[PDB]
PDB file of C-alpha atoms and ligand atoms in Angstrom:
ATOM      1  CA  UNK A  19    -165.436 -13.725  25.752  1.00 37.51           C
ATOM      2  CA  UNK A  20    -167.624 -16.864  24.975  1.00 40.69           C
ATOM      3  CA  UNK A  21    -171.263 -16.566  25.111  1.00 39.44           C
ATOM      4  CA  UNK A  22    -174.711 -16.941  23.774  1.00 40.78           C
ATOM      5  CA  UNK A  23    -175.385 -14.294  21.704  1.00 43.78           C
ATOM      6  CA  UNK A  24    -174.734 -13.706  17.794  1.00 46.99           C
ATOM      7  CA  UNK A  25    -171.530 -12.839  17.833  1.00 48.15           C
ATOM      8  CA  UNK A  26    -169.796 -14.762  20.358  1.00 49.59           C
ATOM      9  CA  UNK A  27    -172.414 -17.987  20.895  1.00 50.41           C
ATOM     10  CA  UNK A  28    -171.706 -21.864  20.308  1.00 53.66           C
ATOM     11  CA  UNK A  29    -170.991 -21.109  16.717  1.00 52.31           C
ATOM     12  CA  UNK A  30    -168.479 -19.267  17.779  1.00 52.44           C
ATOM     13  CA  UNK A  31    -166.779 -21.581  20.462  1.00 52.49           C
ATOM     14  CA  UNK A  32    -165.072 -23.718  18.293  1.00 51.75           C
ATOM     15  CA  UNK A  33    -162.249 -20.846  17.741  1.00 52.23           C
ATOM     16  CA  UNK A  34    -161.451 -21.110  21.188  1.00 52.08           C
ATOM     17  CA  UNK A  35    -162.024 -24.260  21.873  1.00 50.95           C
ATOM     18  CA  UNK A  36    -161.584 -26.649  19.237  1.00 53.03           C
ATOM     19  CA  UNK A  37    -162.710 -29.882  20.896  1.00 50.12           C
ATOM     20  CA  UNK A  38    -166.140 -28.178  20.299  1.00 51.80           C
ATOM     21  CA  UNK A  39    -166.330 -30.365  16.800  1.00 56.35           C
ATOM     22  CA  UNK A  40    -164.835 -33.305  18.615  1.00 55.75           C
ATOM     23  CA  UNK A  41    -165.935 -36.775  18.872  1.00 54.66           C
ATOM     24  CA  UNK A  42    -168.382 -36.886  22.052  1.00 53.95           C
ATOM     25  CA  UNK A  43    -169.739 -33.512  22.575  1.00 54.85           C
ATOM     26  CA  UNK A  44    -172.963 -32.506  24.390  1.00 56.80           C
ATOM     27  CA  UNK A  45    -175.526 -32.331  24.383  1.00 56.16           C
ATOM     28  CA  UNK A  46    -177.065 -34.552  21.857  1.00 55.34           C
ATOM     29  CA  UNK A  47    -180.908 -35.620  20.715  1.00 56.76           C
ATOM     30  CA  UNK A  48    -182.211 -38.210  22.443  1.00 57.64           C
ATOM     31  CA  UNK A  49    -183.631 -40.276  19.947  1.00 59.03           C
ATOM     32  CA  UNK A  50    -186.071 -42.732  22.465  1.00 59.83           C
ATOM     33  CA  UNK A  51    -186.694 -45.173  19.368  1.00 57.80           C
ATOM     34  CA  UNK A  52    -183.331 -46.106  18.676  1.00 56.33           C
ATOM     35  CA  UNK A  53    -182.260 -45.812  22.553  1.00 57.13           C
ATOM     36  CA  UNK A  54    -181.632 -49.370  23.430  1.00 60.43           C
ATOM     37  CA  UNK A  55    -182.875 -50.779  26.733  1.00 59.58           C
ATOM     38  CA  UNK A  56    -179.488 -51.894  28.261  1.00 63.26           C
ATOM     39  CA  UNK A  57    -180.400 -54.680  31.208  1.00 64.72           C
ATOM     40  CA  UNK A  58    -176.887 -54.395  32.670  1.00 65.10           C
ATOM     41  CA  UNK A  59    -177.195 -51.268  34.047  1.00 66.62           C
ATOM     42  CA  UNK A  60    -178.086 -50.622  37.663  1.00 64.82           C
ATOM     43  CA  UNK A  61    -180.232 -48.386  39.353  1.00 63.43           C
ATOM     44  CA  UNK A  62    -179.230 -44.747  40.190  1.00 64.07           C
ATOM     45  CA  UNK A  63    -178.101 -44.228  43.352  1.00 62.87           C
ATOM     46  CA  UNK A  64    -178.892 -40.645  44.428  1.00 64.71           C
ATOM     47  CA  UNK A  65    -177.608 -40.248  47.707  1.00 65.30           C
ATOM     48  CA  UNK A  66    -178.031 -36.740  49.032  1.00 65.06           C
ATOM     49  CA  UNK A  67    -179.163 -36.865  52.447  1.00 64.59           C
ATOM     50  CA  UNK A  68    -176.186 -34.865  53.785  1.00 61.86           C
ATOM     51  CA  UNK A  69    -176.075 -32.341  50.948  1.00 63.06           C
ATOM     52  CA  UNK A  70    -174.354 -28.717  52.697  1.00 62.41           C
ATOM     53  CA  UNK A  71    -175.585 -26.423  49.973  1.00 58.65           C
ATOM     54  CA  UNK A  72    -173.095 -23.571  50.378  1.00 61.39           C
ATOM     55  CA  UNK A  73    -174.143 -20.197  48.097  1.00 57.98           C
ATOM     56  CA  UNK A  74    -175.819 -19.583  44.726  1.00 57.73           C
ATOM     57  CA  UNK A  75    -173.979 -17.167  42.335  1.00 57.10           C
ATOM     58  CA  UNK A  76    -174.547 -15.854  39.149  1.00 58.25           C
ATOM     59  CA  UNK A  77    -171.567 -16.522  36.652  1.00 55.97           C
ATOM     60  CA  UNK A  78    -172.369 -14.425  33.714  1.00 58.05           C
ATOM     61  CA  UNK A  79    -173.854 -17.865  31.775  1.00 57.39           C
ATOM     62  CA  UNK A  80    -175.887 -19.578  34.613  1.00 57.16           C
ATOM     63  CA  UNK A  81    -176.801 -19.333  37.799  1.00 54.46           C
ATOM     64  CA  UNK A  82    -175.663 -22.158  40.726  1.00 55.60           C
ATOM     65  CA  UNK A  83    -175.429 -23.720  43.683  1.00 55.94           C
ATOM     66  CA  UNK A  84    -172.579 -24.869  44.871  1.00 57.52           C
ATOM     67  CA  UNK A  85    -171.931 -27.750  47.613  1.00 59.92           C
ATOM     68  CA  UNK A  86    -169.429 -28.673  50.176  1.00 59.38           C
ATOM     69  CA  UNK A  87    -167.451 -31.805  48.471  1.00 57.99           C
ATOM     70  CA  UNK A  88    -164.389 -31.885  50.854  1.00 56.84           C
ATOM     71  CA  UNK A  89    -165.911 -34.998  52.053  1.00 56.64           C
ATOM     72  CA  UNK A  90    -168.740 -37.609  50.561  1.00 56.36           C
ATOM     73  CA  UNK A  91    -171.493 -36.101  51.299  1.00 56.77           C
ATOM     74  CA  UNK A  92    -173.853 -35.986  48.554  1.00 57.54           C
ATOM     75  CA  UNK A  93    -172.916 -38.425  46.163  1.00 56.91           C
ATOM     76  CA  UNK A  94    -174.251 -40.278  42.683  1.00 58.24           C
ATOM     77  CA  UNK A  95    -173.500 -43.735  42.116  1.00 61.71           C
ATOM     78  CA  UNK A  96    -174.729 -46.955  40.479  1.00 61.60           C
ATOM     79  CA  UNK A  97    -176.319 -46.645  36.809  1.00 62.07           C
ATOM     80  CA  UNK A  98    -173.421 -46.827  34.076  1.00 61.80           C
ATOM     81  CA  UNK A  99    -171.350 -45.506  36.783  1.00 63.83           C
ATOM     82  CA  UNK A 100    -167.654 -47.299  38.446  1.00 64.64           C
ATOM     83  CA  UNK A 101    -167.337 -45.302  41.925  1.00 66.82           C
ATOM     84  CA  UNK A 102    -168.351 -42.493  44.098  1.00 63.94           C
ATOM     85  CA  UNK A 103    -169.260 -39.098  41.989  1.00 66.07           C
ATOM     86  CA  UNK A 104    -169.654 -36.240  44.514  1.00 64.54           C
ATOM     87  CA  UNK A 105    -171.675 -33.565  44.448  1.00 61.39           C
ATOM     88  CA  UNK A 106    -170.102 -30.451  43.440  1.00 61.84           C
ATOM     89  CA  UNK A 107    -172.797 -27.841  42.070  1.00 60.11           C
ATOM     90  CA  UNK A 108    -176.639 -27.355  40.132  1.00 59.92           C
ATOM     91  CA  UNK A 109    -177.392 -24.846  37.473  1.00 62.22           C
ATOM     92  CA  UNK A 110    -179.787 -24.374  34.964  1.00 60.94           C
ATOM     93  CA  UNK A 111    -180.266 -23.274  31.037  1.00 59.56           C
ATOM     94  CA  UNK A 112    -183.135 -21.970  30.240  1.00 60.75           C
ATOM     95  CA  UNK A 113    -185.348 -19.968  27.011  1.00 61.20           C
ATOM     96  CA  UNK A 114    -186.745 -17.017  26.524  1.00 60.14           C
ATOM     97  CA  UNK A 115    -189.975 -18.915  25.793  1.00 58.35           C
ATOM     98  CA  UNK A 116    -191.315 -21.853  27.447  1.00 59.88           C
ATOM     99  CA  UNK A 117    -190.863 -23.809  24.320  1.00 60.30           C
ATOM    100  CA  UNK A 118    -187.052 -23.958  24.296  1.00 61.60           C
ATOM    101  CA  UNK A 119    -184.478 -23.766  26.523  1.00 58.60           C
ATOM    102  CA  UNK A 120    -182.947 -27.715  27.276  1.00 59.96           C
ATOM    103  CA  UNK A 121    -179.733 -28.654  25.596  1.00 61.31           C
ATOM    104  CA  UNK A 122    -180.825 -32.313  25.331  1.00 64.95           C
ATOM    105  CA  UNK A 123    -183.753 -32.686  23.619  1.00 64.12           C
ATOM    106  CA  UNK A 124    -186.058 -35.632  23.034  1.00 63.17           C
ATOM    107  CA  UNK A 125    -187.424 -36.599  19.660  1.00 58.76           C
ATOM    108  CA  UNK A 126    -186.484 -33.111  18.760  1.00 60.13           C
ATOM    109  CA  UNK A 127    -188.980 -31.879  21.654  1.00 58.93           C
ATOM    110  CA  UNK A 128    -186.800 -28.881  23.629  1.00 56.81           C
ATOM    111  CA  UNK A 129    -188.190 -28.327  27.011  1.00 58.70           C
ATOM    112  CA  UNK A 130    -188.437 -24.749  29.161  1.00 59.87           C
ATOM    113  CA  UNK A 131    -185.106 -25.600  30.640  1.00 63.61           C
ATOM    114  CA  UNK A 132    -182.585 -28.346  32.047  1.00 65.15           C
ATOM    115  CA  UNK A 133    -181.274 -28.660  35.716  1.00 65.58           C
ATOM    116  CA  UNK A 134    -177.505 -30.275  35.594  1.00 64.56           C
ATOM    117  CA  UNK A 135    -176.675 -31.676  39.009  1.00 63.68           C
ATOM    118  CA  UNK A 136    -172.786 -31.629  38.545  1.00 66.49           C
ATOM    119  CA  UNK A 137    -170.589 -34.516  40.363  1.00 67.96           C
ATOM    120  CA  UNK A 138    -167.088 -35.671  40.032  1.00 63.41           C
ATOM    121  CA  UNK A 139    -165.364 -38.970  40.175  1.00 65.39           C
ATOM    122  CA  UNK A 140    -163.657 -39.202  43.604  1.00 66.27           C
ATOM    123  CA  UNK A 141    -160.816 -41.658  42.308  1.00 66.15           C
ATOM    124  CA  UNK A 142    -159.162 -38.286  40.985  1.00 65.34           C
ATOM    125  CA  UNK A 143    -159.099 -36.443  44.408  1.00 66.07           C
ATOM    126  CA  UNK A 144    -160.237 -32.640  42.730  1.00 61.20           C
ATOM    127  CA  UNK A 145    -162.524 -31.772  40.246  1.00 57.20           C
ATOM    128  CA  UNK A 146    -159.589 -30.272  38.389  1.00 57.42           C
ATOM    129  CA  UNK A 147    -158.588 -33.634  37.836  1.00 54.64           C
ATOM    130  CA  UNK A 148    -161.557 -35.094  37.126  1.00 55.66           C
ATOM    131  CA  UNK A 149    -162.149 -32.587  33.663  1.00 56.72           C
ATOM    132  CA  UNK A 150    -159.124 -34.274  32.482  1.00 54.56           C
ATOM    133  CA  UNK A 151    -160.174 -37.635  32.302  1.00 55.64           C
ATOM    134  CA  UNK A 152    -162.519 -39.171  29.983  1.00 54.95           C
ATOM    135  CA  UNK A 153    -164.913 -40.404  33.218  1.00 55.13           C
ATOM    136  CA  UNK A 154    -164.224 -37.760  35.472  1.00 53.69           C
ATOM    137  CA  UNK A 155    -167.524 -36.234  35.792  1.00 51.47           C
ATOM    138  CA  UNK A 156    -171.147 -37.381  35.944  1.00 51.39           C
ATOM    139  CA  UNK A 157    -174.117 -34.702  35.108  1.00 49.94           C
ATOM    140  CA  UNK A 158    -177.439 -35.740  36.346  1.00 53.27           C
ATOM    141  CA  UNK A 159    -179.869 -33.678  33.705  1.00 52.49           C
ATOM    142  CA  UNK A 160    -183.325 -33.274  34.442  1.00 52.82           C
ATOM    143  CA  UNK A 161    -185.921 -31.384  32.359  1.00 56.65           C
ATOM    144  CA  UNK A 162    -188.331 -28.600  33.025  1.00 55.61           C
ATOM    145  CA  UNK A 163    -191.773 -27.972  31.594  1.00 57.95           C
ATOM    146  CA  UNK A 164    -194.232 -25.148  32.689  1.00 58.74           C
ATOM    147  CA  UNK A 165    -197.017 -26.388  34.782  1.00 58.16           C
ATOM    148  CA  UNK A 166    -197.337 -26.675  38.446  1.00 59.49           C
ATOM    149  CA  UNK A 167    -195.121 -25.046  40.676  1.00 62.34           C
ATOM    150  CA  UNK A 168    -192.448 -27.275  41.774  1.00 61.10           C
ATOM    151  CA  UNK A 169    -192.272 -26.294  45.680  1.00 61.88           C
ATOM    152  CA  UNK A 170    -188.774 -27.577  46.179  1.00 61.06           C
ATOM    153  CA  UNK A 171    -187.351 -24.682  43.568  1.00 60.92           C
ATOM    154  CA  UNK A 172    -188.856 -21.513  45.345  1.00 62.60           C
ATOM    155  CA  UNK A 173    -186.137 -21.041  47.746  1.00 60.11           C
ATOM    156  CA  UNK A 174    -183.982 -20.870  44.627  1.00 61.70           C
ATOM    157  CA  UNK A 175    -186.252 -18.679  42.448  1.00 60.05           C
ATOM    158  CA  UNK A 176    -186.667 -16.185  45.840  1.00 56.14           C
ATOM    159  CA  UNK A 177    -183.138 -15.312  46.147  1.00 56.03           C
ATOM    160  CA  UNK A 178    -182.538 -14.658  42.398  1.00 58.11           C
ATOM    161  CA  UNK A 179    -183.569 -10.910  42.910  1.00 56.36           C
ATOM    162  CA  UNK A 180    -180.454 -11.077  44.712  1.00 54.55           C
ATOM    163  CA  UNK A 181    -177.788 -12.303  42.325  1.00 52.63           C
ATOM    164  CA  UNK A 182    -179.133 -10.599  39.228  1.00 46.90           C
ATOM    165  CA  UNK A 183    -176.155  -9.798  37.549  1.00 48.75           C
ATOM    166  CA  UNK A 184    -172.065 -11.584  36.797  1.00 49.33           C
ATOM    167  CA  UNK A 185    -170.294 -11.806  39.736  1.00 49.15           C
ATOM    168  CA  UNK A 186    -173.000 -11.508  42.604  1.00 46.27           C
ATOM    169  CA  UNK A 187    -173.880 -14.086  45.232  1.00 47.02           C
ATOM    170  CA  UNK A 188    -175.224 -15.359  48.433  1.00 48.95           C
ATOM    171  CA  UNK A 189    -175.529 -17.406  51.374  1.00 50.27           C
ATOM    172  CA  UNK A 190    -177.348 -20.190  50.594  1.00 47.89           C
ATOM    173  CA  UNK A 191    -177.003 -22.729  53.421  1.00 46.89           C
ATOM    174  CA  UNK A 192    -179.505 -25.339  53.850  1.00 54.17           C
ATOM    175  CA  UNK A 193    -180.909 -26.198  50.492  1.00 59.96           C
ATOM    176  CA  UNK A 194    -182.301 -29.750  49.670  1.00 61.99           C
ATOM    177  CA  UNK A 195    -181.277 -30.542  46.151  1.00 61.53           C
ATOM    178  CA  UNK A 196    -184.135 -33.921  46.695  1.00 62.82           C
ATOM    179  CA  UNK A 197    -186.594 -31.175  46.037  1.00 61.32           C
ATOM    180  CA  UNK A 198    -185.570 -30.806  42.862  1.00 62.51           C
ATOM    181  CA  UNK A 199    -186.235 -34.515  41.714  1.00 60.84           C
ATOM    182  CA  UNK A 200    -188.736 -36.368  39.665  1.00 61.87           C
ATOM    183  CA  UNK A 201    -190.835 -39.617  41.550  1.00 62.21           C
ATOM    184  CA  UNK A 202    -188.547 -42.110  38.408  1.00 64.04           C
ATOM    185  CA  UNK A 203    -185.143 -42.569  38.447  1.00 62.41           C
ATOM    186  CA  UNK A 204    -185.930 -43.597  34.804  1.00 65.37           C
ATOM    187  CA  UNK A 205    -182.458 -42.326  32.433  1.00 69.18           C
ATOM    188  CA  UNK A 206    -180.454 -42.280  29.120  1.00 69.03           C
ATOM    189  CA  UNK A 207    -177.310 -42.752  29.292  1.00 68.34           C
ATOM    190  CA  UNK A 208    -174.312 -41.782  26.814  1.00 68.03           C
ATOM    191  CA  UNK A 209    -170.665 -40.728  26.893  1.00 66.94           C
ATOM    192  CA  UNK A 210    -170.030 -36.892  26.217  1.00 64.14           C
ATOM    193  CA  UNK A 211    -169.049 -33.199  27.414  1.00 63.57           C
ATOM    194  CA  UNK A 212    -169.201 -29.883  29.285  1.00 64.36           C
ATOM    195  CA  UNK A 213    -171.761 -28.353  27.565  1.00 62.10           C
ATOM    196  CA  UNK A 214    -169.998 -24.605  28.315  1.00 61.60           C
ATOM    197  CA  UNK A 215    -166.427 -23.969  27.583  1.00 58.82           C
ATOM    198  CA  UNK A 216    -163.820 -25.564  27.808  1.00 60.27           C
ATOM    199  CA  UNK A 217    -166.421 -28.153  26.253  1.00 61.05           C
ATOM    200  CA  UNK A 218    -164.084 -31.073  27.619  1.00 61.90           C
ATOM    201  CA  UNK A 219    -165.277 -34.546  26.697  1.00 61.53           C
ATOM    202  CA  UNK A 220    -164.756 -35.989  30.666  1.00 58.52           C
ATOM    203  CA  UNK A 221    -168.759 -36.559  31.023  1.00 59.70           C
ATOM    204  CA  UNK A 222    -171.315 -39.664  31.816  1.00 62.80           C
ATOM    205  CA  UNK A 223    -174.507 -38.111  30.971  1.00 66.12           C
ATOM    206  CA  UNK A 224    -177.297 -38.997  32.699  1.00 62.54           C
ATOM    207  CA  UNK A 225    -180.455 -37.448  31.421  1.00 61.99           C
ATOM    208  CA  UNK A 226    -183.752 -38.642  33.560  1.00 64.27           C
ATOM    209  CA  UNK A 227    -187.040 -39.446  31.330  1.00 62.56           C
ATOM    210  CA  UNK A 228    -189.352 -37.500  33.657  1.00 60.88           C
ATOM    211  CA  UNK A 229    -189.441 -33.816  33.649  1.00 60.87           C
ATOM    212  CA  UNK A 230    -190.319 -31.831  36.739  1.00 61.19           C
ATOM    213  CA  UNK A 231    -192.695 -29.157  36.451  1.00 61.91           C
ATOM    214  CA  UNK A 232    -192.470 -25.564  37.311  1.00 60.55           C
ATOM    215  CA  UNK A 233    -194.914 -22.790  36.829  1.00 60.20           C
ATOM    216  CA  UNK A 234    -194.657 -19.824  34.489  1.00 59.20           C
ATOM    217  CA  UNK A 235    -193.801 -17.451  37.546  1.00 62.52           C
ATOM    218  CA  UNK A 236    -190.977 -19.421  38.592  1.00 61.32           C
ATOM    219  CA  UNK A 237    -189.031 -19.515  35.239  1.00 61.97           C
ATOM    220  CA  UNK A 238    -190.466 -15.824  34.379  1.00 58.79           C
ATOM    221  CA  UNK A 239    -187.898 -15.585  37.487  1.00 57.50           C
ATOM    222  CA  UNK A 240    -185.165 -17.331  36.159  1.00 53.78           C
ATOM    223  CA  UNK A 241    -185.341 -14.439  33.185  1.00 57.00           C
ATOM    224  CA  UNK A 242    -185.025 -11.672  34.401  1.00 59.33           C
ATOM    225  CA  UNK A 243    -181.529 -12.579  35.432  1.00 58.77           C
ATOM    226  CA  UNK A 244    -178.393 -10.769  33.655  1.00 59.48           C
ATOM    227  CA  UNK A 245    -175.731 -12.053  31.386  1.00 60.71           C
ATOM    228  CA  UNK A 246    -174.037  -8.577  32.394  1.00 60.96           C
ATOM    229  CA  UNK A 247    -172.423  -7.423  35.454  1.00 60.56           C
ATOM    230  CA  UNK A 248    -173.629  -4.794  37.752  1.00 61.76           C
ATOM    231  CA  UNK A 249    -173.220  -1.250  35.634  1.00 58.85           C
ATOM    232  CA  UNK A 250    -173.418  -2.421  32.228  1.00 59.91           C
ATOM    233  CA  UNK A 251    -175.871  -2.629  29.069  1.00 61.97           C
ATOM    234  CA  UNK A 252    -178.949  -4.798  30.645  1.00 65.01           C
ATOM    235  CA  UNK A 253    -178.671  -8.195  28.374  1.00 62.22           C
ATOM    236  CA  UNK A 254    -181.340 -10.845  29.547  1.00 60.66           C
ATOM    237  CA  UNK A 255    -179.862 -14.225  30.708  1.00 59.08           C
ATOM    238  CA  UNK A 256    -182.228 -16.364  28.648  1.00 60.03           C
ATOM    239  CA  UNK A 257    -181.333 -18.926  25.770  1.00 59.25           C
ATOM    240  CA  UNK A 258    -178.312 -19.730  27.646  1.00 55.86           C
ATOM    241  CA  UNK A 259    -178.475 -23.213  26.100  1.00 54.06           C
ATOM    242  CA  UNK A 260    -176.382 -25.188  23.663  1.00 52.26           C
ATOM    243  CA  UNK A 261    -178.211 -27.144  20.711  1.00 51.52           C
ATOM    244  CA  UNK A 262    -177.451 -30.619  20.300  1.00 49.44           C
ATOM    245  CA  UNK A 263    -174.274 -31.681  18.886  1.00 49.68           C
ATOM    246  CA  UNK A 264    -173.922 -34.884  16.075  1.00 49.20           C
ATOM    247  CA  UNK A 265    -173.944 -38.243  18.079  1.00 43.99           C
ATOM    248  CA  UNK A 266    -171.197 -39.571  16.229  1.00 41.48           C
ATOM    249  CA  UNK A 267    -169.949 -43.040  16.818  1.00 42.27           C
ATOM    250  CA  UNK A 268    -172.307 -43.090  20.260  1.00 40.42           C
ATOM    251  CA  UNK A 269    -175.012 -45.243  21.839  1.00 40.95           C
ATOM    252  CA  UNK A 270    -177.196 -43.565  24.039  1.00 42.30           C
ATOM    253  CA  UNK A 271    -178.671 -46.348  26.417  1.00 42.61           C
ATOM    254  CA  UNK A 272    -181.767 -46.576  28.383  1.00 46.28           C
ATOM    255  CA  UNK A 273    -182.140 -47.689  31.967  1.00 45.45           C
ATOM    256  CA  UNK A 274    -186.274 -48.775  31.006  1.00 46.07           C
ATOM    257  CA  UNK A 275    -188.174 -50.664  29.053  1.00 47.27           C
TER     258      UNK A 275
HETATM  259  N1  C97 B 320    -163.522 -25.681  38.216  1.00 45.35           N
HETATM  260  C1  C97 B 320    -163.600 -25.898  36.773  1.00 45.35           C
HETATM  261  C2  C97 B 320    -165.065 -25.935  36.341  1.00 45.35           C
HETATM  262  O1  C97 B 320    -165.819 -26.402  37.139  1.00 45.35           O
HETATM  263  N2  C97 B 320    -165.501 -25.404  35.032  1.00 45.35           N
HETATM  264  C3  C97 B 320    -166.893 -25.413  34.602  1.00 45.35           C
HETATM  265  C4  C97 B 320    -167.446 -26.792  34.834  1.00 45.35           C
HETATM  266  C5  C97 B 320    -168.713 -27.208  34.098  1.00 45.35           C
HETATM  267  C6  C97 B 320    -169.538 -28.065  34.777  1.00 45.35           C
HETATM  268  C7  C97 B 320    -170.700 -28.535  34.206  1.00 45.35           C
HETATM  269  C8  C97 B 320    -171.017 -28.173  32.922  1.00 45.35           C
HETATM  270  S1  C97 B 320    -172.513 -28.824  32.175  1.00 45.35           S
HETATM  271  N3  C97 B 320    -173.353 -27.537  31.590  1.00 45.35           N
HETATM  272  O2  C97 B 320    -172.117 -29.704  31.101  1.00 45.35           O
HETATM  273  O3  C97 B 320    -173.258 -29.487  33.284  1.00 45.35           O
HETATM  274  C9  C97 B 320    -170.188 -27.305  32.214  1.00 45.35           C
HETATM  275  C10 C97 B 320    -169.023 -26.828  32.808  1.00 45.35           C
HETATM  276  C11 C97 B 320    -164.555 -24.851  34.074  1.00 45.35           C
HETATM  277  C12 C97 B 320    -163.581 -25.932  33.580  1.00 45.35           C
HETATM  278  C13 C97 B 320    -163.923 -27.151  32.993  1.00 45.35           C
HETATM  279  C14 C97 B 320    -162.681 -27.807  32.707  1.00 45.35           C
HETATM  280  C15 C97 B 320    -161.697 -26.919  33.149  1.00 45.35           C
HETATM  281  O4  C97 B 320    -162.273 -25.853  33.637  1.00 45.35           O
HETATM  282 ZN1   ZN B 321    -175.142 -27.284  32.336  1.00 40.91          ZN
END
């Protein structure tokens, strides 16, 4: 029932899903001027050398990759992170116009879109779990702006044509989510939420300073997917992005100087 559009968007959510007013929801402005350096955290780990990239499916809000996690394969650790966060899946949000499209901004700025590189903690065995706890899951966001192509994303934006509408997907074996990746490891870092329904506040965020770039024709791509499933009124999958929520009683910290 939930959405993006007028009638059924993150206004709306709130109905269902109460929590969506709660105390540490995503995602949030990034305010860099009153993000404190924190010198106790560590460096990202980003370990996904053995990544088994498994299919890519459209789900009516996003489109995504999902990964093999019955075993440690692909795994974040280190930053503001305690334990092993396996890789699970990557989607995007995304604009109808290269000026919006992120859920986190920064300094108000919204970017073209936001990759979320979704893990979960493996202390609680499934990912089912893991939404139920407060740490359960850690989201690695990165942000997209329209420039250069960003070679590492066309096997993705190739295959959309495939998987244009809710419910559709495909083999996608052998993709290397390392393409996908900025040269810093620079981050914020807060406490917050699934930034889709059921909105549950079991997230680490951890939002990378650098943006990659992509060119126009790759996102023009990522539009022309469908919110709609095969046989129904064509609704463009664009603006599939929450705005930022109030901080509340949160820090957001910074890994940099
Ligand atoms: N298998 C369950 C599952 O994965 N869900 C979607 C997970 C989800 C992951 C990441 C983000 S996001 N955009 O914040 O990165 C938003 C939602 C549904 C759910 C959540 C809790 C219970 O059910
Ligand atoms: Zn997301």
């Amino acid at each position: 029932h939930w959405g993006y559009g007028k009638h059924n968007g993150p206004e709306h959510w709130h109905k269902d899903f109460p929590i969506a007013k709660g105390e540490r929801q995503s995602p949030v402005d990034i305010d860099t001027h009153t993000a404190k350096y924190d010198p106790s955290l560590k460096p990202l780990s980003v370990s996904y050398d053995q990544a088994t990239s498994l299919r890519i499916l459209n789900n009516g809000h996003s489109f995504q990759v999902t990964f093999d996690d019955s075993q440690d394969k692909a795994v974040l650790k280190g930053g503001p992170l305690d334990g092993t966060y396996r890789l699970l899946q990557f989607h995007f949000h995304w604009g109808s116009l290269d000026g919006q499209g992120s859920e986190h901004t920064v300094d108000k700025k919204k970017y073209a879109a936001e990759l979320h590189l979704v893990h979960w903690n493996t202390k609680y065995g499934d990912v089912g779990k893991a939404v139920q706890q407060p740490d359960g899951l850690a989201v690695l966001g990165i942000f997209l702006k329209v420039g250069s192509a960003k070679p590492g994303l066309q096997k993705v934006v190739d295959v959309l044509d495939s998987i244009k509408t809710e419910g559709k997907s495909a083999d996608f074996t052998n993709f290397d989510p390392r393409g996908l990746l900025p040269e810093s490891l620079d981050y914020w870092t807060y406490p917050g939420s699934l930034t889709t329904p059921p909105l549950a506040e079991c997230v680490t965020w951890i939002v990378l300073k650098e943006p990659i770039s992509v060119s126009s024709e790759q996102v023009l791509k990522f539009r022309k997917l469908n919110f709609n499933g095969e046989g129904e009124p064509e609704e463009l999958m664009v603006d599939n992005w929450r705005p930022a929520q109030p901080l509340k009683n949160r820090q957001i910290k910074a890994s940099f100087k």
